[PDB]
């Protein structure tokens, strides 16, 4: 949340977007 919130994720479900499921993470 916050800095890491709707922006990243690749405005999907936290895994399949954003490059890998580490990114949302952040």
């Not at 949340?1 to 952040?26: K, L």
């Amino acid at each position: 949340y916050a800095g890491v919130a709707f922006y990243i994720f690749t405005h999907q479900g936290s895994d399949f977007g954003p490059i890998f499921m580490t990114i949302p993470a952040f």
